[PDB]
Design a binder for this molecule. Structure first.
Ligand SMILES: Nc1ncnc2c1ncn2[C@@H]1O[C@H](COP(=O)(O)OP(=O)(O)OP(=O)(O)O)[C@@H](O)[C@H]1O
Ligand SMILES: Nc1ncnc2c1ncn2[C@@H]1O[C@H](COP(=O)(O)OP(=O)(O)O)[C@@H](O)[C@H]1O
Ligand SMILES: Nc1ncnc2c1ncn2[C@@H]1O[C@H](COP(=O)(O)OP(=O)(O)O)[C@@H](O)[C@H]1O
Ligand SMILES: [Mg+2]
Ligand SMILES: [Mg+2]
Ligand SMILES: [Mg+2]
Lengths: 27, 54, 467, 484, 470, 138, 138
């Protein structure tokens, strides 16, 4: 779509360092 | 019976998770816009202050 | 003393050139020829026999050339026992239409801070009857207490609760300094204290003095009224040797007034836009508000956080000057929990196991721990659902929510808002109730039963009522 | 005395006219007795920063050159004295008998005068002395948010220094210097009270630049304290300095520079804030034997708003320091007190700046804790006892072991004992909430009964096989007898 | 020579008025009367025959009216074979306490850049021995190598390891420019090279010259030490037709020092806060550090990434000036993989199947692709669960983790940190091992076996030890 | 909007003074400062063109006083002063429901209540779209 | 980089003028302004050192004009004017995919489409890394 909109990428879940990233790391 | 119930529940739960993610991203996008504008304003103010001090 | 002609008038900054004898900085210059006293405070010796001054009232009508006469001393205010029961402005003039304040001694607005060898180290727990404060962030007697909060979060309600629960019983005097707040609040408090008897309009049994610098005042006045209230408190602390409770409203307004005049004082703006002397002037003001070896001043200062942002320079700097800090959060208010004290942000210096007690310390720390774990699980909850949690985790979530509800307490000053009678809970009851909740004794009770209740007994009674 | 006339005095900045022989960075004395420092030498005026309230200063005042670049009274006569930024005593115990004055802006030791960090700078904190060891001459940053315990860590180290100072050997003796920048007078007084009830004041110099004190004074305080430590460093003695709230020095520099009309930069901090902090911390060094072998250890403290260590001053100070001790609020309110994030907290080993006995248990403790951190970050337990549950139980045990109270520094041998008890698996069976009780009880039991063991550990500096066997006996016996 | 007088001392910017002919910009001015040597380099001709000068040392003690002489040349440093084994300052003064540096040739730090017709077009390959570098981002002989990284990520350790592996083996001389770094690290390097033999205090066989300006130095000094070091390297390139290795630590300090003085120089701040003359000055420095047709200079430059933000102007501009880039990611270092080279961010110009060979290129691209697919899979894992992925997904994750572990290589300079003995992996062995792991020949081996090892022969051997200890 | 920024700046004060007549003369008046946000924008323009140092959101630091002095004039005078009233209903336009913005929080800190209107309810047909949960009156 | 800022500022215009010869004489030409961002940086350096008032990211306000008076020279002239063409392929380096930055926004607005390349695709096997979705041709 419009390029201006923020675009996510692979690994963002782990890059965030939040609970979901930690869950993925431990799992 | 269990398998059908499990699949239906999984579908519903994933739909609900998607809805929650949608609400969260809406809020985060609003925050992102505010922060971006603030950053631009702050750098503008810094540059102006540096120019005037000269 | 010395007569100077006004050279420039920009906002509240008046540039006066004195022919001879430049008034020393921080002197009180009186404008001649105005219907009401307009005192200018010398701020900078610009040079060429010219002094830049900050006005303490409106500058409308000033003309270039108008004579200004030096007083020879900084702005002085009536100080003493007669001040009790009387309302004063920044310059000290009575604004209660009760007559002149006939004090035997007059003190200067500006004064040096108590020295290092005069500081006291005693720390005691001032029970406030508020669950969140008394348990998580106990308030110290004689220590500087700060109520951080944004717009419409409960700062003035909380400070009114502190006045009702503590100031009424306090054997010493008190001073309430209103800096940059709505005038109607002052009128309410004045009449409320008159009704309660704290301000007696018949005999000198009044125990509270009022200094008001409300938002209608010009920026210069709002930057000095806090110093006026501090001076009248200082007299009671030192000369009378009596314990005082200095309640100040929105100390932030003191800083905000400085930012407005800093631009007109010719200073390079600092971060955000605040004055470059934020830390220094704030410290100069705060350092004077300290318990010394002569007397004690328990300071309850409400601090407004701009945009509910605590990284803003004004609220951020204030943190270093407070023994006990209470941070109200809008989100907690959105959930309905009142008071909106943030359990994991409010801190205190008397939360030491050798001071507050081992049992109290353990209970507070455990409550904070379980709430922190719930916060850590918030994201997983928000996306997946509580279903995708361990039954042990569900226990932590269920217990934590009960604690959050129990932190809420009906307030006496909020009876006219919520319709629920206020509940002043003794400290022991708070500690015991939170012990019981942490242990799991009341896991069967619904979480709603813990909301807006007093002691845990009321919680169980409400739980049964919820049949 | 070549003098000048104050053209303008505003907000502590005096544009003195005259002083044609004034040196840059030289102290000047005003008519009222206030002392200032010449910073902005301009073609027609001299920008002087007054070290005090500027109300006494007025236009037309006579400013006399002192004739010397700003210096601080230096020596060992300042031990036990609370002084200000200019070395003036504020403890009311009398004049300081300093015979030597050292410039506050001296250069740091060069490449040659320095030698590798060797001596261990014990802090008395289990987590610091085990997973992030600090050596003498190493600049370690106690970075964290507000009310996180950085000052607690510093004061605990200060108190820990007592057990060496009251001994005999001068090599282990570590004189301390606390520089309070921006902290209120009541807070500084409370710190002094703690030190003088633990009898640590006898070897500490408390330089204080409180909020009431002028911005120039707050800016100068760290350099003053650093010079006072340099006295010990260059005489062969070992010294420690804690620049509490170096961030508050940054705001003082910002005020001073902006009021001096120096153009602002990032966050209005003057562009030379990096140098402001660099020249201070670089002085901390371990002198080589030819230069006396003395050392100066620096523990700067930085407050990070909302835990953003990517902020300007935090990044500047982080780059300068050798290692960083990260204190996080979430750990503090999760029960880990001290709240040291051992995963992110890093410290250069100081070329073996940790005692051998501590190393032996600390290596395995570190590896186990790393593995525990990697695996136990889910809280969504499904079923692997042998692999995970074994590991995470040991991790919980070691974390409870790392938890420590306030104002109770532990000697290195006692830390070795408790860390041994936990790391050998002897406490794996012990209840996770009873680990702390076991720690306290075992510490007391060792100190009372098996004090000879602690003495041997301390004397040797290494746990030999025989000492290990003795420790095995002690821990097993007490563990069996721990619960009556 | 046209003796000037100081008219203003503000910070490090000192203004001097020359009654006689004004000194041209970039010339060195010597302040008379100071106990030590203070050199002021002309920056701007303000006007009224006044020059704005940046001091190369402390400005304390300067008094308005103090006489300042003009050297007539930009800062000149002792340069030649006699600088080997000697530590020199920005102004070319011996700081090793070993007496004066007696070189018969003096050269100015400021000089023009090599011309376009002098640029070499050859691209060789330099086998450092690091598995990550040699495979993914191979360094080139004569090319400009860049060690991008944050704080505490491995830049200094990696550059010291590169010195140990390459510079020691390399016959040609080397130069180390410690721009704005910790003084402790400078002493550590000096002592380490003394015992290693690279610097011989007794004989004259030293192979590395040292130019140090630490962060203790004033901002002006920290902005020219790189120029002094590269001038020495240029002498070892033009006057002597030899291959040189210029190792500079934290070039970022070169840019940062300019930001600390631009405001006083009188320049309007540019974005974020850097000086408006960021790219121009950085190019002026970097273009000089190149391999001309006369001689080769393989330059390894450490670049601090402020707040781990590669978008920051200082690291962003330096990307264009470097042939081979190796970015050290903190997240990988948190995982423990040392070196922390980011496999999916590091790039090299010689990464061309024509240059490195088809097999090398194919293996490297396969490694990068499998790691990208692993990054993609992690997001799925976070929601679904590891025991929910397909067998192909599980196989990909396992192989990617094995490859990531095998990227880690123990370093000799890091023997003190890790405790494991340092290993050096030949390029052929690196390619063979990663190719085997991609094929799956070692899928049966545990992931732990591939962590902190040398060749895959060490990898398989470690697995057997764990089984014996199982 | 076509009118000059100084005019937009003075308009609220001009309106308040007209109602002050009724308040002081024992009469009750209602003043509605619709779009005070735009008065804040006009004041920001005046300040920036006056080279006053901008603050958060580029707004000058005296923007709080700008609205405080206006709103404070609204009051219920006592019997001795005629017992008049100057009930004020200022309007602030939030962007994407940003009630935590500078001008919104400033005006909330001055006013004795807020009636929060929600675009969600307005589109959902609940008109008036008063959010009872957040609406409060002291 | 060694070339002074004005040379970097004038290089694109010189190249375009060289290209115009072909376009104005019935010959088709293609120009590739690699790193048009660096030209904007050089122009910013010139403007700020010339004390020209700054703007967003310190770029002078006329940077859009600087880029527009260059890219608009690219044209397909009609038969009467020779029928020549001057195709333009400017290159802009976005920082972390920030297509909303000053220079990226300006160049995107000026150009008749873009060819967006993503590092994710480059390391995912998609070489060239052209993102078909974002890439568009007017
Ligand atoms: N080891 C500890 N265990 C438990 N609580 C502790 C410990 N150390 C300190 N505290 C408590 O933590 C709180 C904050 O500690 P401290 O005063 O050191 O914080 P700080 O970050 O230096 O504060 P400030 O922002 O005021 O400078 C105090 O209540 C203190 O008693
Ligand atoms: N403890 C409480 N119980 C019920 N309502 C409260 C409580 N505290 C605050 N509120 C509501 O939130 C509002 C907070 O605003 P107030 O405290 O009056 O000013 P501010 O918080 O802006 O200083 C109050 O007007 C009140 O309606
Ligand atoms: N093999 C390794 N490579 C790099 N760093 C390592 C390695 N092993 C351990 N480390 C730790 O990582 C740190 C990297 O820091 P260093 O390179 O000195 O600073 P910077 O990363 O800022 O250049 C080292 O101090 C060391 O403690
Ligand atoms: Mg209020
Ligand atoms: Mg502290
Ligand atoms: Mg390093």
């Amino acid at each position: 779509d419009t390029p201006e909109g923020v675009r996510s990428g692979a690994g963002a879940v782990r890059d965030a360092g939040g609970a979901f990233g930690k869950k993925e790391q431990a799992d | 019976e269990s398998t059908t119930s499990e699949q239906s529940a999984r579908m519903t739960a994933m739909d609900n998770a998607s809805k929650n993610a949608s609400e969260m991203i809406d809020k985060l996008t609003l925050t992102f816009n505010r922060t971006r504008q603030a950053v631009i304003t702050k750098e503008l103010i810094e540059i102006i202050s540096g120019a005037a001090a000269l | 003393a010395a007569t100077g002609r006004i050279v420039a008038v920009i906002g509240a900054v008046v540039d006066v050139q004195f022919d001879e004898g430049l008034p020393p900085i921080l002197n009180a210059l009186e404008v001649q020829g105005r219907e009401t006293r307009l005192v200018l405070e010398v701020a900078q010796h610009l040079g060429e026999s010219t002094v830049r001054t900050i006005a303490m009232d409106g500058t409308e009508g000033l003309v270039r050339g108008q004579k200004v006469l030096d007083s020879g001393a900084p702005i002085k205010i009536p100080v003493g026992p007669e001040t009790l029961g009387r309302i004063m402005n920044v310059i000290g003039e009575p604004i209660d239409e009760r007559g002149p304040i006939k004090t035997k001694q007059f003190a200067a607005i500006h004064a040096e801070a108590p020295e290092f060898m005069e500081m006291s180290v005693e720390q005691e727990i001032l029970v406030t009857g508020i669950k969140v404060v008394d348990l998580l962030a106990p308030y110290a007697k004689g220590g500087k207490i700060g109520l951080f909060g944004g717009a419409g979060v409960g700062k003035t309600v909380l400070i009114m609760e502190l006045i009702n629960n503590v100031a009424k019983a306090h054997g010493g005097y008190s001073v309430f300094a209103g800096v940059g707040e709505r005038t109607r609040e002052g009128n309410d408090l004045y009449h409320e204290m008159i009704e309660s008897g704290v301000i007696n309009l018949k005999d000198a049994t009044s125990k509270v003095a009022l200094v008001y610098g409300q938002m209608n005042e010009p920026p210069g006045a709002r930057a000095r009224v806090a110093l006026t209230g501090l001076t009248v408190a200082e007299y009671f602390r030192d000369q009378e040797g009596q314990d005082v409770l200095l309640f100040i409203d929105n100390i932030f307004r003191f800083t905000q007034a400085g930012s407005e005049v800093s631009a007109l004082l010719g200073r390079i703006p600092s971060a955000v836009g605040y004055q470059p002397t934020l830390a220094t002037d704030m410290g100069t003001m705060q350092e004077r508000i300290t318990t010394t070896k002569k007397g004690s001043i328990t300071s309850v200062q409400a601090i407004y956080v701009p945009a509910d942002d605590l990284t803003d320079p004004a609220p951020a700097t204030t943190f270093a000057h407070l023994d006990a800090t209470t941070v109200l959060s809008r989100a907690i208010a959105e959930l309905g929990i009142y008071p909106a004290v943030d359990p994991l942000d409010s801190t205190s210096r008397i939360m030491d196991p050798n001071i507050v007690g081992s049992e109290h310390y353990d209970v507070a720390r455990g409550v904070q721990k379980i709430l922190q774990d719930y916060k850590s699980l918030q994201d997983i909850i928000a996306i997946l659902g509580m279903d995708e949690l361990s039954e042990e985790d569900k226990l932590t979530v269920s217990r934590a929510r009960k604690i959050q509800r129990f932190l809420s307490q009906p307030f006496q000053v909020a009876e006219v808002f919520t319709g629920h009678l206020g509940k002043l809970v003794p400290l022991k009851e708070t500690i015991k109730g939170f012990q019981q909740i942490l242990a799991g004794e009341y896991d069967h009770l619904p979480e709603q039963a813990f909301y807006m209740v007093g002691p845990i007994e009321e919680a169980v009674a409400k739980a049964d009522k919820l049949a | 005395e070549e003098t000048g006339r104050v053209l303008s005095i505003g907000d502590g900045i005096a544009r003195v006219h005259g002083l044609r022989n004034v040196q840059a960075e030289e102290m000047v004395e005003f008519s009222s007795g206030l002392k200032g420092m010449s910073l902005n030498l301009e073609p027609d005026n001299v920008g002087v920063v007054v070290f005090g309230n500027d109300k006494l200063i007025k236009e037309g005042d006579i400013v006399k050159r002192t004739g010397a670049i700003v210096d601080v009274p230096v020596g060992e006569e300042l031990l036990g004295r609370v002084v200000d930024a200019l070395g003036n005593a504020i403890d009311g115990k009398g004049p300081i008998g300093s015979k030597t004055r050292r410039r506050v802006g001296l250069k740091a030791p060069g490449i040659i005068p320095r030698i590798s960090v060797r001596e261990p700078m014990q802090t008395g904190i289990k987590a610091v002395d085990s997973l992030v060891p600090i050596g003498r001459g190493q600049r370690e940053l106690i970075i964290g948010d507000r009310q996180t315990g950085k000052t607690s860590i510093a004061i605990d180290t200060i108190i820990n220094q007592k057990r060496f100072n009251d001994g005999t050997d001068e090599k282990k003796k570590l004189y301390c210097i606390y520089v309070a920048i921006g902290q209120k007078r009541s807070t500084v007084a409370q710190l002094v009270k703690r030190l003088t009830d633990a009898d640590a004041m006898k070897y500490t110099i408390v330089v204080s630049a409180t909020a009431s004190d002028a911005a120039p004074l707050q800016y100068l305080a760290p350099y003053s304290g650093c010079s006072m430590g340099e006295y010990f460093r260059d005489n062969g003695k070992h010294a420690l300095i804690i620049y509490d709230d170096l961030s508050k020095q940054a705001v003082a520099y910002r005020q001073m520079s902006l009021l001096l009309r120096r153009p602002p930069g990032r966050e209005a901090y003057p562009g030379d804030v990096f140098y402001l902090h660099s020249r201070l911390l670089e002085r901390a060094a371990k002198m080589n034997d030819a230069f006396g072998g003395g050392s100066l250890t620096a523990l700067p403290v930085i407050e990070t708003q909302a835990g953003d260590v990517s902020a300007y001053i935090p990044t500047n100070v982080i780059s300068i320091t050798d290692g960083q001790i990260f204190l996080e609020t979430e750990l503090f309110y999760k029960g880990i007190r001290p709240a040291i994030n051992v995963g992110l907290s890093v410290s250069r080993v100081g070329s073996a700046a940790q005692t051998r006995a501590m190393k032996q248990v600390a290596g395995t403790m570190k590896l186990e804790l790393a593995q525990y951190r990697e695996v136990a970050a889910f809280a969504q337990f499904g079923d692997l006892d042998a692999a995970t549950q074994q590991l995470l139980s040991r991790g919980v045990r070691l974390t409870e072991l790392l938890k420590q109270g306030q104002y109770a520094p532990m000697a290195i041998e006692e830390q070795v004992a408790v860390i041994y008890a936990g790391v050998r698996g002897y406490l794996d069976k012990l209840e996770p909430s009873k680990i702390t009780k076991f720690e306290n009880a075992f510490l007391s039991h060792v100190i009372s009964q098996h004090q000879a063991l602690l003495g041997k550990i301390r004397a040797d500096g290494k746990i030999s096989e025989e000492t290990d066997a003795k420790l095995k006996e002690i821990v097993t016996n007490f563990l069996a007898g721990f619960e009556a």
